[PDB]
Design a protein around this ligand. Structure first.
Ligand SMILES: [Mg+2]
Length: 389
């Protein structure tokens, strides 16, 4: 039978490492400790233990100790590890694999990292070898992240059911204690910040260079991916009221999708903004340009997807609300503030509106999301003065 004590000890071992990292002040010293800690871990591998974020049956065979990184200098600094596993068909009928004798991490292309680690590993030759990643957070409450994950998965199910081609990428969350857990990061994606820094290009010119020129299938495909993911995250950001959007917490993948990460401030999280914002989702000049501009066909597609996505969401509203209620009862998180949280969430599904009214609302919301475009300061004085322009 599959024993749970080995798994418990495995997970505990990852969390124990963090307490020892906390004894050191700088990220550099923490990283040095972490490498040594993971080296010890390999004494006990392979074993009948698994990474629950895998999503497929496997055994852990190795942790490439030199490849792990601590992410900051905080007392309970997150740390990122890579974990080698051997996939198996059926866990409970598979034997434990035999042991085989023996800044850049974030920017570096995933396929390059997989290549190097595979080359260095005694297990890298096996066809069922896979590389996983987790970020261990010993001092962060991840229950808000878990709630977001659950809601994001439900929206994907809803959009699939309603045949709306919105795209999002939920990332897996394990809640360990009330103030610790793990995350499976999104790989093969780079923050918008880093893409722009390394390339010194606008997003459009980056797309043109990386995917292809205007007349190419690759450009159009990438543009479509961008639009579908933009619309998906627009709706995520609105319905869950995700704050603190910037180019550090929006990632771009190799297919042209954007991916929002870090839902620290959702629903009734403090501080509530004072800027009369509908959402922290912003549509910048750069983003609109990737979509072919304000009069662009792909921008029109964006707006259509937003409408159809919202129609789909309200059609299945109870499936989302239930998730949030189940969490609110079981826990007591800072994203909740009494009974107004659920009321306000339901109100964002606009159940009283006709689809005609919803369409007008979407036009309004999209206009709002573009308010920080310089042109808006330039071209909206009719609302601020008795002039008609
Ligand atoms: Mg006026």
């Amino acid at each position: 039978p599959v024993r749970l004590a080995p798994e418990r000890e495995f997970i505990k071992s990852l969390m124990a490492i963090g307490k020892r990292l906390a004894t050191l002040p700088t990220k550099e010293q923490k990283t040095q400790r972490l490498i040594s800690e993971l080296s010890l871990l390999n004494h006990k591998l392979p074993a009948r233990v698994w990474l629950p974020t895998a999503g497929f049956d496997h055994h852990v065979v190795r942790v490439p100790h030199t490849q792990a990184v601590v992410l900051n200098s905080k007392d309970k600094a997150p740390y990122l590890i890579y974990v080698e596993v051997l996939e198996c068909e059926n866990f409970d009928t598979t034997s434990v694999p035999a042991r085989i004798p023996e800044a850049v991490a974030l920017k570096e292309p995933w396929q390059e990292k997989v290549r190097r680690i595979r080359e260095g590993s005694p297990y890298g030759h096996l066809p069922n070898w896979r590389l996983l990643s987790v970020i261990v957070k010993c001092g962060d409450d991840l229950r808000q992240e878990l709630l977001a994950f659950q809601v994001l998965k439900q929206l994907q199910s809803i959009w699939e059911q309603e045949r709306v081609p919105l795209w999002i990428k939920p990332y897996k969350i394990l809640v360990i204690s009330a103030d610790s857990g793990m995350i499976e990061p999104v790989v093969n994606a780079v923050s918008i910040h880093q893409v722009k820094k390394q390339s010194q290009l606008s997003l459009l010119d980056y797309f043109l260079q990386e995917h292809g020129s205007y007349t190419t299938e690759a450009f159009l495909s990438a543009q479509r991916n961008f639009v579908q993911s933009c619309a998906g995250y627009c709706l995520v950001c609105y319905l869950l009221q995700v704050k603190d959007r910037h180019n550090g917490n929006i990632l771009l993948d190799a297919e042209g999708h954007i991916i929002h990460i870090d839902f620290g401030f959702i629903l009734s999280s403090s501080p509530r903004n004072l800027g009369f914002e509908t959402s922290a989702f912003k549509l910048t000049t750069e983003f609109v340009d990737v979509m072919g501009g304000l009069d662009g066909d792909m921008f029109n597609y964006y707006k259509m997807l937003m409408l159809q996505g919202l129609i789909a969401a309200r059609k299945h509203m109870d499936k989302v609300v239930q998730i949030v209620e189940i969490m609110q009862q079981g826990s007591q998180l800072p994203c909740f503030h009494g009974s107004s949280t659920i009321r306000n969430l339901k109100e964002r599904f606009h159940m009283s509106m006709t689809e005609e009214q919803l369409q007008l609302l979407v036009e309004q919301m999209v206009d709002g999301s573009m308010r920080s475009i310089t042109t808006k300061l330039y071209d909206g004085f009719q609302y601020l003065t008795n002039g008609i322009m």
